[PDB]
Every structure is written in C-alpha cells, then in structure tokens.
C-alpha cells in the first residue's frame, strides 16, 4: 500500500514513487525490472 520506496522495484503497478522528484530507471540498455534510483533534473531539494 502507498507509493514506491527509494531503490525499490517500480513493478509496472499504477502506483508512482514516493515524492514528486523521484524517478524510475533501468541500468541495462534494455530492461523492464526498473527501480526508483534517480531524481528528475533541476530538483532543488534538501
């Protein structure tokens, strides 16, 4: 229940990652098992 946690699987579920600045990424050039292990560009966070 609730949003996807940091460096956890994005899981192809309707649920987004926790915090509007956090974003999903796959490390291989092709992939689907991607994780929320990055931030959107120009996020002014602390």
Between CA 16 and CA 30 the distance in angstroms is 21
Experimental method: NMR
CB 10 within 8 A of CB 38: no
CB 28 within 8 A of CB 41: no
Between CA 21 and CA 29 the distance in angstroms is 23
CB 26 within 8 A of CB 11: no
CA distances for 18 relative to 8, 14, 25, 29, 40, angstroms: 10, 13, 14, 25, 13
The residue behind tokens 């600045």 is 21
CB 4 within 8 A of CB 36: yes
Between CA 5 and CA 24 the distance in angstroms is 11
CB 4 within 8 A of CB 18: yes
Domain boundaries, the chain: 1-46
């Amino acid at each position: 229940g609730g949003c996807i946690k940091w460096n956890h699987s994005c899981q192809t579920t309707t649920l987004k990652c926790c915090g509007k600045c956090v974003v999903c990424y796959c490390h291989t050039p092709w992939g689907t098992n991607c994780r929320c292990d990055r931030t959107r560009l120009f996020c002014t966070e602390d």
